[PDB]
Every structure is written in structure tokens, then in C-alpha cells.
Amino acid sequence: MGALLDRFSGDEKKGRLIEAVCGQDLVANDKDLAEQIVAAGVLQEIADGDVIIKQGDWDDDLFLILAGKMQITINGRPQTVREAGTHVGELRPRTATVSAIGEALVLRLKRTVLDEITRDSPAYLKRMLDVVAG
């Protein structure tokens, strides 16, 4: 479908999406960094049961969960569920088989593009250093 997607795509819903991105672990109300991550990434609507990540795979991809819920799973056993505002994958092959619990919207990025954004943000770099305690 695109009902969720449609709530977010186009110049029309640019604000709502940017607004959404800021309320993420990594962005932490750094707007410039979202506006960049907005441009860098591709919105995807995901059906209930739809896999964004096979585990054992080498997807450099990392998804911002903008709306809905993702069920992390390892070796057959449910782990966490990430939700609106969180992210999935990395920061080695793939840890977990992430899948969608209900309709979910994500923003998909490549490790590569991600870090050239990462690496230019004093703000993010500062925030990853603070969380580096043993």
C-alpha cells in the first residue's frame, strides 16, 4: 500500500518527515543532520511479516523506523521490538532477521552515505563519544 507512505512523501509532507527524523536515537534534534538524512534515504512501507533483513546477510543498509514496529529475531527466537524513533542493524554479517509487526514505514540508508553524514556532524560524533563508557 502507500497510505502510511503517502502521509510522508513529497514536498507536501517534508516537515512531518524531517520532524519525524529528529526524534531518532542518532539525530537527537539535530535538524541539519535530518535534512541531510532525508535527502540521503528512501521511504519504504512494509507489510506485516515483511522482512527488511535476513540474518547472515551483508546488507550495509540501516533503517530509521519512522512509524510502526519491527521485531528483531535471532536463530528462531524473538529478541527486542524497535518502534517509531529507533533504528535497526549496525553502527561482520547480519545479527538478526528484522521483520515488520503490522504496516511499518522506514527510511533506508547505506552504511557508506550514512558515515559521510555521521563524519561531518560535530553533534552526532559528540553523542557517540558520551555513550562510549565501558
Numbering used by the authors: 1 to 91, 98 to 140
List sentences quoted exactly from the publication behind this structure.
This anti-phage system, termed pyrimidine cyclase system for antiphage resistance (Pycsar), contains a pyrimidine cyclase PycC and a receptor protein with either transmembrane domain (PycTM) or Toll/interleukin-1 receptor domain (PycTIR). Upon phage infections, produced cyclic mono-pyrimidines activates their receptors PycTM, which disrupts membrane integrity by forming transmembrane-spanning pore, or PycTIR, which deplete NAD+, leading to growth arrests and cell deaths, thus protecting the uninfected bacterial populations, a strategy called “abortive infection”. In this study, we aimed to structurally, and functionally characterize both cUMP- and cCMP-synthesizing PycC and cUMP receptor PycTIR.
The loop connecting β5 and β6 and the last ten amino acids at the C-terminus are unresolved in the NpPycTIRCNBD crystal structure owing to structural flexibility. Structural comparison of NpPycTIRCNBD with PsPycTIRCNBD shows r.m.s.d. of 1.1 and 0.9 for 116 and 117 Cα pairs, respectively.
